């Protein structure tokens, strides 16, 4: 918070500092992220994550998310 407070002095106009309810850069609430992680609907792919959908090849989905079907 102090880092962004110092930086906003370099910009014209008003800037606000807000705490995000989401987990990191993912657009999911902290409660939802825990639920998806427990269900195995997440695939750790680098700095970000990918989700499991009901559409697509069954083998590809089950191979990429083995825990979501056990």
């Amino acid at each position: 918070l102090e880092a962004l407070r110092r930086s906003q002095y370099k910009f014209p106009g008003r800037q606000k500092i807000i705490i995000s309810k989401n987990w990191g850069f993912t657009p999911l609430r902290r409660e939802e992220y825990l639920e998806k992680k427990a269900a195995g609907k997440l695939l750790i792919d680098g700095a970000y994550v990918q989700f499991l959908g009901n559409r697509g090849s069954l083998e590809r989905n089950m191979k990429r998310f083995p825990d979501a079907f056990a």
């Binding site: 069954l58 089950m62 079907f69 056990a70």
Partner: protein, 300 residues
């Protein structure tokens, strides 16, 4: 270093399919839009097309008119219908096209009620002749006019397409016409050989091939023309066979006569068709199969 997928999903998303008959490769819409287009100051006057198609083992001739909601068949004539008139062999040769064209022309005039007005060339002599307006008490009456539609068939000299078109014109149907593509027409010297043309009309060209085969290769003659010799029809019996074939069409164009036992209705085979038809799965049927597949691969 490594190529990319041409298709991926944007190719499918932006792909625009051709017309269904174009994808199936059956219609030439470039020629169709010109065959089917009536002058707007001819408000409701159909343009009749002579559809000539040559499938294997068959010839299909139709008089087709065009409508916004589809096409209408004015009359039809099939080569397999010539069996009633005595034509058993060579149902898809050049002469069978002439007889089918003659059969269709007689059917059209009978449907129109003009059979006694236009008779065309009663005895075929292979002469370039146009169906002219008949002279009656009221004066001149213009003949029924139809246009040839070859489809995707090549329009080369001596093609069977012009055989049906020649047969229809001799029947009494006016067709815009030219002799450049008849057999015996010499491109270098623009004359039409009538003796060659009337030779083709009566199945002549088949006869010398049977004659040449008999002299040179008896075994090849046996294989090609086994059905001819089995039914005892020699080379000289061809031109006579087509002689009364034309006459029988002139006298009766709607002769059913010959039939193959047994006769039948329409309903009970519709019941037969439904018995052989497979049915799509339902939502729960699809869902259950997915659950089974998951279980099998998880345990595997």
């Amino acid at each position: 270093a490594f190529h990319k997928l041409v298709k991926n999903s944007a190719y499918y998303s932006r792909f625009q399919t051709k017309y269904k008959r174009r994808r199936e490769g059956k219609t030439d819409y470039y020629a169709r839009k010109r065959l089917i287009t009536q002058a707007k100051n001819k408000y409701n006057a159909p343009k009749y097309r002579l559809v000539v198609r040559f499938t294997n083992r068959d010839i299909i001739l139709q008089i087709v008119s065009s409508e916004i909601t589809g096409d209408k068949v004015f009359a039809s004539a099939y080569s397999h219908e010539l069996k009633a008139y005595g034509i058993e062999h060579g149902l898809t040769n050049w002469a069978a096209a002439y007889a089918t064209g003659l059969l269709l022309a007689r059917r059209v005039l009978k449907k129109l009620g003009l059979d006694e007005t236009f008779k065309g060339v009663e005895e075929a002599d292979g002469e370039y002749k146009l169906t002219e307006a008949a002279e009656t008490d009221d004066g001149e009456r213009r003949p029924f006019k139809a246009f040839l539609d070859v489809g995707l068939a090549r329009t080369s000299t001596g093609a069977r397409v012009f055989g049906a078109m020649k047969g229809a014109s001799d029947g009494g149907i006016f067709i815009p016409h030219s002799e450049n593509r008849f057999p015996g027409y010499d491109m270098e010297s623009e004359e039409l050989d009538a003796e060659t043309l009337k030779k083709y009309i009566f199945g002549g060209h088949v006869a010398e091939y049977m004659e040449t085969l008999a002299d040179d290769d008896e075994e090849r003659y046996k294989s090609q023309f086994n059905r001819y010799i089995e039914d005892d029809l020699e080379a000289d019996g061809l031109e006579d066979l087509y002689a009364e074939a034309h006459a029988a069409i002139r006298e009766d164009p709607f002769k059913k006569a010959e039939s193959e036992a047994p006769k039948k209705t329409k309903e009970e085979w519709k019941a037969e068709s439904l018995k052989y038809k497979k049915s799509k799965l339902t939502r729960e049927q699809r869902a259950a199969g997915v659950q089974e597949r998951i279980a099998a691969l998880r345990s595997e």
